[PDB]
Design a protein around this motif. Structure first.
Motif, short mmCIF file in Angstrom:
data_model
loop_
_atom_site.label_atom_id
_atom_site.label_comp_id
_atom_site.label_asym_id
_atom_site.label_seq_id
_atom_site.Cartn_x
_atom_site.Cartn_y
_atom_site.Cartn_z
N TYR A 1 -20.77 -40.49 -31.69
CA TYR A 1 -20.31 -39.10 -31.63
C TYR A 1 -18.86 -38.92 -31.20
O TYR A 1 -18.37 -39.62 -30.31
N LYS A 2 -18.21 -37.96 -31.85
CA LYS A 2 -16.91 -37.44 -31.43
C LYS A 2 -17.16 -36.38 -30.36
O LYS A 2 -16.30 -36.13 -29.50
N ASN A 3 -18.34 -35.76 -30.42
CA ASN A 3 -18.75 -34.71 -29.49
C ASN A 3 -19.31 -35.24 -28.16
O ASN A 3 -19.39 -34.47 -27.20
N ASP A 4 -19.66 -36.52 -28.10
CA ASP A 4 -20.48 -37.07 -27.00
C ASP A 4 -19.90 -36.64 -25.64
O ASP A 4 -20.59 -36.08 -24.77
N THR A 5 -18.61 -36.95 -25.52
CA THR A 5 -17.85 -36.66 -24.30
C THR A 5 -17.88 -35.17 -24.01
O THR A 5 -18.11 -34.75 -22.86
N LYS A 6 -17.64 -34.39 -25.07
CA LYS A 6 -17.62 -32.93 -24.98
C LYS A 6 -18.96 -32.42 -24.47
O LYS A 6 -19.01 -31.56 -23.57
N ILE A 7 -20.02 -32.97 -25.05
CA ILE A 7 -21.40 -32.61 -24.69
C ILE A 7 -21.64 -32.87 -23.21
O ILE A 7 -22.20 -32.02 -22.50
N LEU A 8 -21.20 -34.05 -22.78
CA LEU A 8 -21.34 -34.49 -21.39
C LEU A 8 -20.66 -33.50 -20.46
O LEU A 8 -21.22 -33.09 -19.43
#
Lengths: 69, 201, 83
Positions: free
Chosen positions: B167-174
């Motif tokens: 994910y490119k979002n993974d960090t964002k999600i976290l």
RNA sequence: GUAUGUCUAAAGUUAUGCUCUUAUUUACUAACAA
RNA sequence: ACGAAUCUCUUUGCCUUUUGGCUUAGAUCAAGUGUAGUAUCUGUUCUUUGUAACAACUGAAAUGACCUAGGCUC
């Protein structure tokens, strides 16, 4: 340390005690006199066509349901 | 020096309980054929107290070494006490609803009682569920499954994968979750141990 | 064993301890002077003291026999363990 | 800092393995300072 | 060997210092320092772990009781 009740304060001592002669509130004369006696669309669904326990009373469960959310 | 205090709201409970244990003690002495000592009644009443607590917990009070009659008697007396408690609690909660004069302490007490009562009720329901199977009829379950399957079938709904390292979002999600969690802690400066741990994490 | 039996059985015992080895009334006063042997009463006194002493030392020995913290707890666990 | 609780506050009652030296910790306490 | 007494132990009996209330488990689990005390630590060094026999005496002093300062006795 701090202990349960076993042998109550027996009113033997309170009897042999001297009178106080105070006038308490309720011993003021209330009710002086006594009384006496004489003597198509509905097809398409999935489903188309007492106990003596205070912890298991219908009232109780219902109450809990009401007062939890 | 014959002071004797009346019962009042403030000392009602203590008086109640002393009366209860006196009654229970009397009954047990009546039962007991050896004519045992007061020190042997201490064991009895202490036993009773433990039983009461066990009832409060909803852990069955099954002490092995007792005579059955005693166990019966204590079971009875705690049921009486329990009855008194539960009804009192119920009365209080209606009272609270009404918005009557009631002790801050008293309201907290009632909250506690009603919580314990709720937990007891709940885990009794769990027991019930266990003891005679799930409420759902298996046919019903099957039907439900069929329905849901049909639905997603109609949708072409691709399921959510187990999240890999892609994910490119993974960090964002976290960052969202953390932010949400932080929201609890930004206001209250003084924090518990658990809270502290969470913050550290 | 009831206190009925344990009395009579202890009665029987002290009779074996015996087996080892006049009335004058002033009815106006009600005073019933039983003049009896002063040597025998002394022999009761010494024997009864000796019986109580024997028992007293018996506990002392049994106290000096030996999952706890203090004197009482050790015994309290012993009260649990006997069951 | 307090509740609270003790204390004192003066008159003579007539009998024949260890000792040692130190430095360090930790704990508790502290109306003492920061 | 039987009877008895004394002593020790063992088995059981006796619990013999042997849990003495209630509430919302009655409630809530921390961010400290230096200064002092107290205790507890640990190291640290060294220390150290007159008597007998033989030879001789059995006893002194006080004042008063006898006799005429002196002489024996108590």
């Amino acid at each position: 340390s701090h202990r349960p009740q076993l042998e109550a304060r027996s009113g033997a001592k309170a009897a042999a005690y001297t009178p106080t002669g105070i006038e308490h509130a309720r011993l003021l004369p209330g009710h002086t006199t006594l009384k006496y006696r004489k003597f198509s669309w509905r097809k398409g669904t999935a489903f188309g066509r007492y106990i003596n326990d205070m912890t298991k009373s219908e009232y109780h469960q219902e109450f809990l349901h009401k007062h939890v959310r | 020096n014959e002071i004797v205090k009346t019962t009042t709201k403030q000392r009602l409970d203590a008086y109640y309980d002393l009366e209860l244990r006196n009654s229970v003690m009397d009954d047990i002495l009546e039962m007991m054929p050896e004519s045992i000592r007061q020190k042997k009644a201490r064991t009895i009443l202490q036993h009773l107290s433990e039983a009461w607590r066990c009832w409060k917990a909803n852990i069955p009070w099954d002490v092995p070494g007792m005579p059955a009659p005693i166990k019966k008697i204590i079971e009875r007396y705690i049921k009486s006490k329990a009855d008194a408690w539960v009804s009192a609690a119920h009365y209080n909660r209606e009272r609270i609803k009404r918005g009557a004069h009631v002790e801050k302490t008293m309201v907290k007490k009632n909250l506690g009682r009603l919580t314990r009562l709720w937990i007891k009720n709940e885990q009794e329901r769990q027991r019930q569920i266990q003891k005679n199977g799930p409420e759902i009829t298996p046919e019903e379950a099957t039907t439900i499954f069929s329905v849901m399957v049909e639905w997603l079938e109609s949708r072409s709904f691709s399921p959510i994968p187990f999240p890999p390292l892609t994910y490119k979002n993974d960090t964002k999600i976290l960052v969202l979750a953390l932010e949400d969690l932080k929201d609890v802690y930004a206001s209250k400066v003084r924090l518990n141990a658990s809270e502290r741990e969470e913050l550290a994490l | 064993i009831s206190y009925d039996q344990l009395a009579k059985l202890s009665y029987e015992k002290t009779l074996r301890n015996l087996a080892t080895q006049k009335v004058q009334k002033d009815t106006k006063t009600g005073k019933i002077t039983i003049a009896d042997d002063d040597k025998l009463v002394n022999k009761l006194a010494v024997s009864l003291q000796s019986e109580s002493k024997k028992r007293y030392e018996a506990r002392k020995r049994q106290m000096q026999n030996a999952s706890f913290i203090n004197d009482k707890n050790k015994q309290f666990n012993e009260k649990l363990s006997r069951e």
